[PDB]
């Protein structure tokens, strides 16, 4: 092919159209094309329907493409991975109908202010959802209902002030929750329920240490081993275990798990 690269990696037919200023999808690409890289180009907009010709398309990358609008037509039978990270999308598109096989969705680092109700309808197979680095303030109620097979959720780095109490309902396979760097202050009663959740990041939050942070206190106490800190160092990333990071808003960086709850109700 003329513009993009091709290369049979094992049993996958990978195509690279990355970082070459493209504005829109090239023409006649391989008919086996399983993977497509369109990163770092200049598209500002795209339309998944134009990909239907690629009936083998297992994976797609449209990251760093200025996308401010994403048309979602027709249907992509087998697409399981969709990267839309590092774009300028004002609003999360409804992938459900068109991407039935999606298991990984990444819209981290965009301009998202809110997620429409039923935003995820139709994505049952979904396992990883990343919405880190956005401007969401609150969430829809049954947001994650359409997706009970979910293993990772990232809502870190947003301006969220409160979570939907039954946000993790149905998720009995969730193994990573990322919420560090947000505006949360309390945690709904029985919000974590009874799953194991080996990885949860809750640091970087103005936690309001009052009588209503108590469910969250005990919880932390029984999960010290499950609370980690995320540190990036432009050449290194670090996930470190530290329940102590979840600290009290004003209370001099006071560990929320150690908050006495003095004077609070008995039960």
């Amino acid at each position: 092919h003329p513009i993009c690269e091709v290369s049979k990696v094992a049993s996958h037919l990978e195509v690279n159209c990355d970082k070459r200023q493209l504005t829109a999808l090239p023409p006649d690409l391989p008919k086996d094309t399983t993977i497509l890289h369109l990163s770092e180009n200049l598209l500002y907009t795209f339309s998944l329907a134009t990909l239907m010709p690629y009936t083998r398309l297992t994976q797609l990358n449209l990251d760093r493409c200025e996308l401010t609008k994403l048309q979602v037509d027709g249907t992509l039978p087998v697409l399981g991975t969709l990267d839309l990270s590092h774009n300028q999308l004002q609003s999360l598109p409804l992938l459900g109908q068109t991407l039935p096989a999606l298991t990984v969705l990444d819209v981290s680092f965009n301009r998202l202010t809110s997620l429409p109700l039923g935003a995820l309808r139709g994505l049952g197979e979904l396992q990883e959802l990343y919405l880190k680095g956005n401007e969401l303030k609150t969430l829809p109620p049954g947001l994650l209902t359409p997706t009970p097979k979910l293993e990772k959720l990232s809502l870190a780095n947003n301006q969220l002030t409160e979570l939907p109490a039954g946000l993790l309902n149905g998720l009995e396979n969730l193994d990573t929750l990322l919420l560090q760097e947000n505006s949360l202050y309390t945690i709904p009663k029985g919000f974590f329920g009874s799953h194991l959740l080996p990885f949860a990041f809750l640091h970087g939050n103005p936690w309001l240490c009052n009588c209503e942070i108590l469910y969250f206190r005990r919880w932390l106490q029984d999960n010290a081993e499950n609370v980690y800190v995320w540190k990036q160092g432009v050449d290194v990333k670090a996930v470190t275990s530290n329940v102590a990071s979840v600290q009290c808003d004003n209370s001099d960086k006071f560990p929320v798990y150690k908050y006495p709850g003095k004077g609070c109700p008995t039960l």
């Binding site: 094992a10 293993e151 990772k152 990573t176 800190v229 990333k237 996930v239």
Partner: protein, 199 residues
């Protein structure tokens, strides 16, 4: 430079970042890695890799999907900052790898190996779920090749490994000075574990 193969491989490096290894000795481990890398087509196309130095939590320097020219990698890998901490939870880095490295299965036909460079012994309070992880990993077709080093290598953990699966063959070295010695032999066993790769 001796013998050297190229295959469908997803190799993870786990370097002990405890004090049981001098800074000077850390370098000799880093060297060991840079070599291991050279003897392998570096690319997200044949042999992907990752370098994580641990102790309290992991410190990811490279990732399997990280797109950077081989030259670039080898460097970074070598610029891995000495930690020398007192603790290095083996249970932690494996909990980490199980869920943060091999959570999903991208290249299903390739082999996976978690070269575990142990030089110390983690505080027993942290091993409660150790086995789980090794199991959950094996369940993901991930092969763990623990490579004990020095007088403080946690043998029981290297042993518990060896017997969780056949490919979980262990390797012991009196010191870092003995890596450049075993290097080849090791990268061998790897070759015989993963499928051939076309140039």
């Amino acid at each position: 430079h001796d013998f050297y193969c190229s295959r469908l491989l997803d190799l993870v490096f786990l370097l002990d970042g405890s004090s049981r290894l001098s800074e000077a000795e850390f370098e000799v481990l880093k060297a060991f890695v840079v070599d291991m890398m050279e003897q392998l087509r570096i690319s997200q196309k044949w042999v992907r890799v990752a370098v994580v130095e641990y102790h309290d939590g992991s410190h990811a320097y490279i990732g399997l999907k990280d797109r950077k020219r081989p030259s670039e990698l080898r460097r970074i890998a070598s610029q891995v900052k000495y930690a020398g901490s007192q603790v290095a939870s083996t249970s932690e880095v494996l909990k980490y790898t199980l869920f943060q490295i091999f959570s999903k299965i991208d290249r299903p036909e390739a082999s996976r190996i978690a070269l575990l460079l142990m030089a110390s012994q983690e505080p027993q309070r942290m091993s409660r779920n150790f086995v789980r992880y090794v199991q959950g990993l094996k369940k993901k077709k991930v092969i763990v090749i623990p490579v004990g080093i020095g007088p403080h290598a946690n043998l029981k953990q290297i042993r518990l490994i060896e017997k969780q699966a056949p490919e979980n063959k262990a390797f012991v070295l009196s010191s870092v000075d003995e890596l450049e010695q075993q290097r080849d032999e090791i990268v061998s066993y790897l070759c015989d574990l993963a499928p051939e790769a076309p140039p």
